[PDB]
């Protein structure tokens, strides 16, 4: 499997392929990562790559010929996933990582362009993914999250929110560890972890609660805990 990024500034890349994950299942021979730079394919006059919209407008637009040669140079076939860097595309999710992992070839559009030439949307670009309603500078970033999340789904819940966990020291600034994670008595650690379940989601995600097939215990857990607050 393969990823390519048009981008142009290909080193903000660095050192986020060249370790952690990335550095690993590239080295063990899973994935092929190519950089590629804008203005190594621009023909215009200045080496642009960007040019004036027709009809006017504010922003400069992303012009549609350095990007088909770049998918030309990338070896680009009728099953490879263009995902174009939009901030009004869909938004990311973990099923498009799953459904992204299953892909042979992928090529990330990665740019700070107010505009793209709608012949690339229409013929070349095959995803237009998100981050979120937020506004970004470009689309970097939001490559190499999508990037992580994918590759992390590569060969190489319960509804309820996290238990806390300790670690090393028992105390620390006068702040003590639960005693019950000491005792060794699995049943009570359980017990204890399942309780903060409860109760953290039922201060902090009641939705979540909501959504939960709740026992007896587990109304019994709640009920003494809210009598305890008064
Ligand atoms: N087309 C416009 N407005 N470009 C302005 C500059 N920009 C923004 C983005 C962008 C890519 N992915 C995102 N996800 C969420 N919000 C975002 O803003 C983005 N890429 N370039």
Redesign the pocket.
């Known amino acids: 499997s393969k990823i390519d990024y048009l981008t142009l500034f290909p080193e903000m890349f660095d050192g986020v392929l060249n370790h952690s994950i990335m550095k690993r299942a590239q080295e063990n021979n899973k994935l092929q990562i190519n950089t590629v730079n804008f203005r190594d394919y621009a023909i215009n006059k200045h080496n642009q790559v960007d040019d004036y919209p027709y009809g006017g407008g504010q922003?400069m637009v992303l012009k549609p010929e350095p990007v088909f040669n770049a998918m030309e140079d990338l070896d680009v076939t009728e099953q490879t996933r263009v995902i174009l860097?939009?901030?009004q595309?869909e938004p990311f999710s973990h099923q498009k990582a799953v459904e992204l992992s299953k892909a042979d070839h992928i090529v990330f559009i990665?740019?700070?362009?107010?505009?793209?030439d709608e012949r690339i949307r229409t013929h070349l670009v095959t995803d237009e993914?998100?981050?979120?309603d937020?506004?970004?500078?470009?689309?970097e970033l939001?490559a190499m999250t999508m990037t992580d999340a994918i590759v992390r789904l590569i060969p190489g819940s319960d509804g309820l929110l996290e238990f806390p966990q300790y670690t090393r020291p028992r105390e620390f600034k006068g702040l003590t560890v639960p005693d019950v994670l000491l005792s060794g008595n699995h049943a009570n650690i359980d017990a204890w972890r399942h309780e903060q379940k409860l109760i953290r989601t039922y201060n902090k995600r009641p939705d979540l609660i909501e959504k939960y097939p709740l026992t007896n215990a587990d109304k019994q857990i709640l009920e003494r805990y809210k009598i305890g607050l008064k």
Not at 110 to 116: A, I, K, L, N, Q
């Open positions: 922003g860097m939009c901030p595309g990665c740019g700070h362009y107010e505009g793209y993914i998100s981050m979120g937020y506004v970004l500078t470009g689309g939001p």
